[PDB]
Amino acid sequence: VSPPPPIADEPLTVNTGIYLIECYSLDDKAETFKVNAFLSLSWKDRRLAFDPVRSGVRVKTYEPEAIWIPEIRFVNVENARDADVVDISVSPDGTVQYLERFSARVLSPLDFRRYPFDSQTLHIYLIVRSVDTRNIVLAVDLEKVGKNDDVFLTGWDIESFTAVVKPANFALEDRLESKLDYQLRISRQYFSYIPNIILPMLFILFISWTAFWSTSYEANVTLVVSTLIAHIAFCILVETNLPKTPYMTYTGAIIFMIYLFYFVAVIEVTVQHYLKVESQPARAASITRASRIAFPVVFLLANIILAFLFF
Amino acid sequence: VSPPPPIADEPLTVNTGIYLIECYSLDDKAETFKVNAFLSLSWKDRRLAFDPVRSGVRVKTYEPEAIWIPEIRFVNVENARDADVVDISVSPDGTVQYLERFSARVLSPLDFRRYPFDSQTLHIYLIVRSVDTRNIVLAVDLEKVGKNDDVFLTGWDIESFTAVVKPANFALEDRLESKLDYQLRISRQYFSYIPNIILPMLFILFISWTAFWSTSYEANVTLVVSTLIAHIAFCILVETNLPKTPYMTYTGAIIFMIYLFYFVAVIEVTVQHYLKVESQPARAASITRASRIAFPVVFLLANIILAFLFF
Amino acid sequence: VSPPPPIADEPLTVNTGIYLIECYSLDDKAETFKVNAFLSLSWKDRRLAFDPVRSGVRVKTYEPEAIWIPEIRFVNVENARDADVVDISVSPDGTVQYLERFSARVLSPLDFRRYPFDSQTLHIYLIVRSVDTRNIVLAVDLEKVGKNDDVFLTGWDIESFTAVVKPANFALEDRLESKLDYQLRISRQYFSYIPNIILPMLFILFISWTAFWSTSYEANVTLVVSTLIAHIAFCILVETNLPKTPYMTYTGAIIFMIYLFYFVAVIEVTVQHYLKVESQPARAASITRASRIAFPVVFLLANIILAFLFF
Amino acid sequence: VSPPPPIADEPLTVNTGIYLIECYSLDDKAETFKVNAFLSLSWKDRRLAFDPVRSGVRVKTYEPEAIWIPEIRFVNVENARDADVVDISVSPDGTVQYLERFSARVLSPLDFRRYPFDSQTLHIYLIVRSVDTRNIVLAVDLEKVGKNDDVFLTGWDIESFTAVVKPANFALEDRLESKLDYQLRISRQYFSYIPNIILPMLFILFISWTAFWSTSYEANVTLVVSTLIAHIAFCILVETNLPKTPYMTYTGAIIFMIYLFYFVAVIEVTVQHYLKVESQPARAASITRASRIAFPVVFLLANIILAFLFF
Amino acid sequence: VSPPPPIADEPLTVNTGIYLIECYSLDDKAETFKVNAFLSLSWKDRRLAFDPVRSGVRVKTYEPEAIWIPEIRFVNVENARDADVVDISVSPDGTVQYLERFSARVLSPLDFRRYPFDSQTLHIYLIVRSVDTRNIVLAVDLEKVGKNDDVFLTGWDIESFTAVVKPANFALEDRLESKLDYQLRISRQYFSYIPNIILPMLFILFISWTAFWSTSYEANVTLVVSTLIAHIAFCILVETNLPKTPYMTYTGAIIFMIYLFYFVAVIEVTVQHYLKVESQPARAASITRASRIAFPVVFLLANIILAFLFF
């Protein structure tokens, strides 16, 4: 089939629309997610026009291999979409009404800075390539863009499925292309972190600090060193889903902070003993008494330093 | 082919039916499972009608590309169903009897609150989209809905495969749609938990409490700290199949409880030593003697507090 | 095409046959395995009959879409079989000789009781559905049922590929169905367990018992507690392929047994110290001397109690 | 299409050829690997013959569904090969020149005895099934068998892609079959093992032996027991890709050996203490002094015992 | 269809072009990555030529099965490319303009020497096979080779998508083949390594060295041995994506170095005690005092020895 000819010199307006049936499987690592949805496209292919008087029909149905349809595709997809044609109904004037049930893995990037409170905007990029005879421009039919009430993305809170109304029109490989931006807004469900990560990962750090209430280097080595294992152990129980960072995570900084508060504790206890062994248990007692407040205070302040910086 | 015309103004009644051949692979994480089953649909497509006198035949067989069949689909499926047409037999009046052997990964959500005693209702959503000329409504042919005696879901106990008789009829993208709810009821096989999780994960917590029967801070640090590793170690051997929770698990609360009974034990032993070092081994002896009953009693009561709350 | 008409009122006999080309990938967890094999079916479709005198041919070859073939399927398969038609040759009388190279993931359940010495019978269920005009019954052509000499299932010992000669004939969804049972017998290759699981997992349990040859509570806490970590650590190195058990494994009981022999050892050492601290190092010395024999003897006997019960 | 008729009574000679484009993904566990290659087959199908004088053409090209091609398949493949037809060119006499770009996962078994120095011969089994009218025998066209210079199997060293010239001709399911053996020879790249497995896994075993340079049972329990954890810990960092063994690995024996040298060390230290506690620090001092040489010597000799046995 | 005949004796020039739509999933292990891109090919197939005067058309569109297209393929691909034809437009002279949207997993090897600062050149090998009548040579249409501004490879920094202008022309299996080299240049995003690997993996190594500030063999065994576990533990938290090395990694050397600085520390502490036990606490005090500087200095120098060697 041939592309529709111009009424005057204008490009073809293809009125897009995506309705999310089911949205799932967000791999924080790969920065992907799978989407199951309806794609409704509208265009005036004048050629198709039929009179209601002569044709006994109302709105004639058509097959995809039976009529011309523009090459509508996605940009940030793994493999091409799992398209399944629903209906192609042509209005008496020649206005086609395309519908399909696509199922493809999207590839939208994520922000792991603000994590575990991280908030995201996922992208779906609709593209259509212009031909040798006429050109194509995309439009957002505001009425066939949305999300079902049944859509669940366990771990995230689906806020609003929107669309960037203005299209991008550009040249590439000697052809005009129309690029649309579909934006999905999500926020994180961080409820479990506090009681099952931050609160237990804190307790471990405090069992470490019971070394300043001791005099015994033999009990403090077993305190500070053991809790370090306890940390890495729990740090392993909590192995999440977080890729390679050329930047810093809000957690990334906190983790680097703990790996110091254990090491610093090791210095303190190594000195607490060496000062006492050299027979000056006056500093060696002022130093232990100091870190009783120094560590907790420095820590609480260091958390505010991070929080104020990141957020 | 064209949809059947109305005898008067009524929509087409498609009499559904699902018989579970094989049910397997329940991923607690993704909240999915794979199903292998038979789909039997019945409708009066008057057009097909043939006389028994003129036609030498009884009940004529037909091909899927040879006759009109309504677009029957599933809502909560990963990728579209692996449909394999069995038989399409038309009764003399024009009553079609469709049958297929679909094989698709369902996406039904789960309740991890009551876990490891968690009980579930899984969902299969049958949908059919209405056309430009007539509309479609779904019905439950109570006689072709069930499960085979051979169906196994190791880890769960398959109770009853049912169907929500009343259909949902609603508008979406300017089209009428009929939505049916197929419900599968399952309960958990928690037998191994008690002797291979709760009972060993308890023993570790008790080897911790043998610190109140000691006077030695050097043996109690090695008791309480070591068992914490022993816990996280076993807690790692027991790494299950449990996604992200914006709520609380019955186990989730218990785990948070243990991470306290170890930390609290650390406080006790840090004080038991500090009281004795400051030369008051009267409290330091009343405090150790107290926790001999305090910890076990507080613990047993704390378990009842949880159990009564969750269940 | 139409099903063959009856010579008198009899159902069609389809003479089955499965020859295992390659058998592999047994997932103990999912209770599955993949099979690559040949399916040879024989039936007298009288219609096809051709005279050797008039037809210049001997045994005419035919295409699958060129002739009627009964809907032969498998019951316990993940997704439908990866069928690849080999040859369809019709004998002068009309006796068809079907052959294909199917490749599908089977779903046969397993017995993890007797494990690591567990022995299995895997199932392949061949089904054929009867039509509106005649019915179908299955037969075992004893000559085209077997296994190649090259078949390997590393970890198991392929004993005998058999077939349940008698077919199951039953009603379901108003249709007669013929169900055949293909049984594959396998046994376990447990050679590595003894020297790389039971023997090292024993040694750890004995380094624990060197606590009765000590007087020092500080060395016994470090003995008994450390070895518990050593156990869970090795118990983690040995993380196998074993699903959810609503019953008990032979290993399951042994594991529960070890988690006691460590806990019991903890009681002993907690008492050994508390008796000595209360100044009665007469029992505290009789109790330590007792467990020198009590633990080993109780243990060896407890293993016989299990072995005699399970086997 | 029909198989070519005999010039006299001979079977058809199909001249095979495999050229490895890309070879990758060797799963030591499943004993598989994926191969991307070219399959060139040559046969004299007399029927196709065309005169150079009458036909304006030279060597006529043909489609796969346009001409007869023998059912060429693989035996040890997961699912059937991902065949992609390249060219089918027929020489004036009727000599067909088939070519395709197959991509399938092979299933060749491995030897884990000599590991990490293990050497392998992988198998590709080409099969062709004979028909009702003529029979088929396979030949190795020595000129279209090889491997590209770009082929990489990181972890192995690709030595030589060969072919077993002599074919296997046998009866199965009343049909003649021709079986060819394609052999790929590979050897292991064990460079990292010595400095990042054997050398660190040795150091751990030596930190254990610093127990004979001590008198203190409290420091030796903490030495020998701790290093056992250190071992299992590192033994876990080194968790490779090695299936179930009904035999013994060269490493399998070494591992069983270390799990003794730790246990034996536990006996020594338990006696070193018990002899000294019973007041005979003359043996208890001869025994400690003995194991200073006994363990290292016994060990070095035990390694030679293994190496000489395995290799 | 037939290949275009020569204007004189020249081979056909196919003007290639690859524009990277989306580039993702780089598996350091398998040495692969997935690419989604546009392939534009240009050739003068004189046969297609049509006059602008007689033909009412301008630049006639054509189907792939409607015209001859050369067998353009990739060499280092897993399975054949997921090709999706965009447009085939023929200019009045007969100059075809092919375009497709391929999606295949590439197989380019990597350098893990300079890692985590490793820099790579990935390969895409375009091949075209010559026929019985004319031959084919490849060309780089410099104008349709590039990468989009949206291309992201999280963990790497996409530098420049280039092409080796000069083609490789060689004989293989009696056929001429044209091989092109597409090179993608990437560099690593090593920001997180320093604060979340090297800095914490250093701290652990320093808590070890607080053994020279002690006199107590019982506290030094618990220091040096415990930190070794802490190391292997963290070394496990940091389990990356790094295959089998027949060479040495920059990290590979550093890791081997740490496994010595712990072992050497074990020797020191075993001697520190044995010298003191033999009553010579003059060396035993000079040796401990020495390693206070010896270890740090030797270490810092050993890092420069590596860095200068690798880089």
Side-chain angles (χ1 to χ4, degrees), chain C residues 152 154-155 192, chain D residues 26-32 108-122 155-156 186 188 193 240-255 310-311, chain E residues 244:
Chain C
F152 83 101
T154 324
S192 199
Chain D
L26 177 63
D27 186 22
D28 300 59
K29 187 86 190 185
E31 299 177 352
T32 67
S108 174
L110 314 161
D111 156 74
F112 290 103
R113 284 139 196 156
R114 287 172 181 268
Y115 180 88
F117 316 94
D118 69 309
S119 321
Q120 306 300 335
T121 301
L122 302 154
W156 300 88
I186 49 144
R188 225 203 184 84
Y193 207 69
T240 59
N241 289 337
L242 295 174
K244 183 178 179 180
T245 54
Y247 54 88
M248 215 46 173
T249 308
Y250 168 64
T251 59
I254 277 144
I255 294 169
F310 279 93
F311 319 110
Chain E
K244 183 178 179 180

Side-chain angles (χ1 to χ4, degrees), chain D residues 115-119 151-159 186-194, chain E residues 31 113 243-247:
Chain D
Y115 180 88
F117 316 94
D118 69 309
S119 321
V151 170
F152 83 101
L153 199 71
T154 324
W156 300 88
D157 289 345
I158 320 95
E159 299 282 69
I186 49 144
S187 304
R188 225 203 184 84
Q189 297 178 346
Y190 65 86
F191 190 78
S192 199
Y193 207 69
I194 294 169
Chain E
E31 299 177 352
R113 284 139 196 156
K244 183 178 179 180
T245 54
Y247 54 88

Side-chain angles (χ1 to χ4, degrees), chain C residues 22 24 28 36 54 65 75 77 85-86 113-114 151 154 161 164 169 171 175 179 192 210 237 277 297 307:
Chain C
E22 282 291 349
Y24 61 103
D28 300 59
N36 204 310
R54 293 182 183 174
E65 292 177 350
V75 187
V77 282
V85 187
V86 186
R113 284 139 196 156
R114 287 172 181 268
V151 170
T154 324
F161 190 73
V164 168
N169 307 307
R175 294 275 184 100
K179 196 164 94 180
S192 199
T210 69
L237 184 82
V277 175
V297 171

Side-chain angles (χ1 to χ4, degrees), chain E residues 5-45 47-191:
Chain E
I7 70 159
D9 206 344
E10 81 288 330
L12 195 86
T13 326
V14 187
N15 287 264
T16 68
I18 321 172
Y19 192 87
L20 325 160
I21 302 162
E22 282 291 349
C23 202
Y24 61 103
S25 271
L26 177 63
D27 186 22
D28 300 59
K29 187 86 190 185
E31 299 177 352
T32 67
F33 64 96
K34 293 179 179 179
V35 74
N36 204 310
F38 282 119
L39 178 66
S40 64
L41 307 154
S42 192
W43 67 92
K44 293 179 179 179
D45 178 17
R47 297 179 298 118
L48 297 174
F50 296 97
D51 209 61
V53 175
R54 293 182 183 174
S55 79
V57 281
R58 293 182 183 174
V59 172
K60 293 179 179 179
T61 312
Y62 285 134
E63 280 290 281
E65 292 177 350
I67 183 64
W68 173 87
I69 283 134
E71 301 158 9
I72 293 276
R73 300 180 316 271
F74 292 101
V75 187
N76 54 354
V77 282
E78 286 243 325
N79 298 69
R81 59 168 199 242
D82 289 345
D84 300 299
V85 187
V86 186
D87 199 68
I88 297 156
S89 50
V90 182
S91 296
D93 289 345
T95 291
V96 199
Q97 271 282 341
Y98 188 83
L99 180 63
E100 63 159 74
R101 205 189 161 272
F102 77 100
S103 64
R105 201 190 175 200
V106 202
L107 196 97
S108 174
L110 314 161
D111 156 74
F112 290 103
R113 284 139 196 156
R114 287 172 181 268
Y115 180 88
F117 316 94
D118 69 309
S119 321
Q120 306 300 335
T121 301
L122 302 154
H123 293 284
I124 277 168
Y125 279 96
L126 268 169
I127 294 169
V128 70
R129 204 186 178 88
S130 295
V131 82
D132 324 289
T133 58
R134 207 169 154 194
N135 304 296
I136 315 163
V137 68
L138 293 169
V140 183
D141 215 335
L142 297 126
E143 278 61 39
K144 293 179 179 179
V145 179
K147 183 178 179 180
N148 199 38
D149 311 68
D150 305 307
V151 170
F152 83 101
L153 199 71
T154 324
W156 300 88
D157 289 345
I158 320 95
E159 299 282 69
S160 49
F161 190 73
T162 54
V164 168
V165 278
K166 228 206 174 286
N169 307 307
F170 59 87
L172 173 59
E173 292 182 297
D174 291 70
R175 294 275 184 100
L176 191 142
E177 235 166 312
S178 190
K179 196 164 94 180
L180 266 184
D181 185 4
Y182 276 79
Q183 293 173 4
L184 174 64
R185 289 163 236 267
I186 48 144
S187 304
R188 225 203 184 84
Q189 297 178 346
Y190 65 86
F191 190 78

Side-chain angles (χ1 to χ4, degrees), chain A residues 25-45:
Chain A
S25 271
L26 177 63
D27 186 22
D28 300 59
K29 187 86 190 185
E31 299 177 352
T32 67
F33 64 96
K34 294 179 179 179
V35 74
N36 204 310
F38 282 119
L39 178 66
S40 64
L41 307 154
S42 192
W43 66 92
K44 293 179 179 179
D45 178 17

Side-chain angles (χ1 to χ4, degrees), chain B residues 9-45 47-290:
Chain B
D9 206 344
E10 81 288 330
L12 195 86
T13 326
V14 187
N15 287 264
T16 68
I18 321 172
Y19 192 87
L20 325 160
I21 302 162
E22 282 291 349
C23 202
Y24 61 103
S25 271
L26 177 63
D27 186 22
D28 300 59
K29 187 86 190 185
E31 299 177 352
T32 67
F33 64 96
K34 294 179 179 179
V35 74
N36 204 310
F38 282 119
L39 178 66
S40 64
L41 307 154
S42 192
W43 67 92
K44 293 179 179 179
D45 178 17
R47 297 179 298 118
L48 297 174
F50 296 97
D51 209 61
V53 175
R54 293 182 183 174
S55 79
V57 281
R58 293 182 183 174
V59 172
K60 293 179 179 179
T61 312
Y62 285 134
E63 280 290 281
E65 292 177 350
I67 183 64
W68 173 87
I69 283 134
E71 301 158 9
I72 293 276
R73 300 180 316 271
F74 292 101
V75 187
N76 54 354
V77 282
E78 286 243 325
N79 298 69
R81 59 168 199 242
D82 289 345
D84 300 299
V85 187
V86 186
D87 199 68
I88 297 156
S89 50
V90 182
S91 296
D93 289 345
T95 291
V96 199
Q97 271 282 341
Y98 188 83
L99 180 63
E100 63 159 74
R101 205 189 161 272
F102 77 100
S103 64
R105 201 190 175 200
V106 202
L107 196 97
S108 174
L110 314 161
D111 156 74
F112 290 103
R113 284 139 196 156
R114 287 172 181 268
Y115 180 88
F117 316 94
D118 69 309
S119 321
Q120 306 300 335
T121 301
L122 302 154
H123 293 284
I124 277 168
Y125 279 96
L126 268 169
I127 294 169
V128 71
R129 204 186 178 88
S130 295
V131 82
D132 324 289
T133 58
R134 207 169 154 194
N135 304 296
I136 315 163
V137 68
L138 293 169
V140 183
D141 215 335
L142 297 126
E143 278 61 39
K144 293 179 179 179
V145 179
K147 183 178 179 180
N148 199 38
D149 311 68
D150 305 307
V151 170
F152 83 101
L153 199 71
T154 324
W156 300 88
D157 289 345
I158 320 95
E159 299 282 69
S160 49
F161 190 73
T162 54
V164 168
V165 278
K166 227 206 174 286
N169 307 307
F170 59 87
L172 173 59
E173 292 182 297
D174 291 70
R175 294 275 184 100
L176 191 142
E177 235 166 312
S178 190
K179 196 164 94 180
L180 266 184
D181 185 5
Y182 276 79
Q183 293 173 4
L184 174 64
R185 289 163 236 267
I186 49 144
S187 304
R188 225 203 184 84
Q189 297 178 346
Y190 65 86
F191 190 78
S192 199
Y193 207 69
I194 294 169
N196 306 298
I197 300 96
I198 294 169
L199 286 161
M201 220 181 277
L202 269 168
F203 294 129
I204 294 169
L205 173 61
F206 307 128
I207 294 158
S208 154
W209 305 351
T210 69
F212 320 120
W213 282 267
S214 202
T215 57
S216 163
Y217 181 61
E218 293 177 350
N220 301 355
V221 159
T222 59
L223 177 63
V224 188
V225 189
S226 265
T227 53
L228 295 174
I229 276 91
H231 182 116
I232 305 170
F234 183 73
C235 213
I236 294 169
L237 184 82
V238 182
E239 56 193 71
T240 59
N241 289 337
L242 295 174
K244 183 178 179 180
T245 54
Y247 54 88
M248 215 46 173
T249 308
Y250 168 64
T251 59
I254 277 144
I255 294 169
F256 191 55
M257 155 167 62
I258 294 169
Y259 286 125
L260 295 174
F261 276 88
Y262 272 128
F263 179 83
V264 168
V266 161
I267 284 296
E268 195 288 318
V269 153
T270 291
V271 175
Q272 175 212 64
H273 156 81
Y274 204 70
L275 177 63
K276 220 167 91 82
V277 175
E278 289 315 285
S279 310
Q280 276 142 251
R283 269 206 240 133
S286 64
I287 294 169
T288 319
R289 293 182 183 174

Side-chain angles (χ1 to χ4, degrees), chain B residues 292-307:
Chain B
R292 295 192 179 190
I293 294 169
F295 277 51
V297 171
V298 163
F299 178 71
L300 264 59
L301 286 167
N303 192 31
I304 302 152
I305 298 152
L306 294 184

